[PDB]
Amino acid sequence: FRTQKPSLNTVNVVGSSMGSGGVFTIDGKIKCVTAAHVLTGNSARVSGVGFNQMLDFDVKGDFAIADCPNWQGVAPKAQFCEDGWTGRAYWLTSSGVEPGVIGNGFAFCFTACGDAGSPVITEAGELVGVHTGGGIVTRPSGQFCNVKPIKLSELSEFFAGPKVPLGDVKIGSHIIKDTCEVPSDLCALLAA
């Protein structure tokens, strides 16, 4: 459940501890987002492809955002996702992009969520928050939702493809197996 390569806008973030982050163009400005607890006060060394620099961050709860105008790399356009948004989401971790879903008052990732500071973005490219603390997603307001197990039938709601028997596919403990029929794309993802 992880791409081979991290996205080009994924960064390492090192302050008082070890984290990662992401770079986006938000209201016309290039910003870096990460987890506030990894900073040395509000400062960290941020590094990625073609970039290595100290940044100072605006902190709200465990959410942190910095202007980074010297960033010359990939900085996809993003706005914060709409309040109440639910759907498929993506964790941008230092070792690759990992799928999951955001539902009402919870998140679920198919794998571990990366370092603290991993951006969580929606299927339309909007920023949900960053992974902190298996774990929590902290939104730009500093409020959070916990990563929780999910019923297999609920997870199905986020996937397409005709219903197929789940058959012998093994599913981890963070999926509550309450059905044995699932949309084909979810079956295929789980079996990969």
Which residues, other chains included, contact 45 with Cβ-Cβ below 8 Å and sequence gap of 6+?
13, 14, 15, 52, 53, 54
Amino acid, res. 38: V
Name the experimental technique: X-ray
CA dihedral 133, 135, 140, 141 (to 10 degrees): -80
User: Please, where are the H alpha helices in the chain?
Assistant: 152-155, 184-191
Is 74 found in the same domain as 110?
no
CATH number of the domain within which 187 lies: 3.30.40.20
| 3-state secondary structure (DSSP) of residue 153 | helix
Is 19 found in the same domain as 72?
yes
Contact 55, 43 (CB under 8 A): yes
Split into its structural domains, the chain has a count of 3
Contact 22, 9 (CB under 8 A): yes
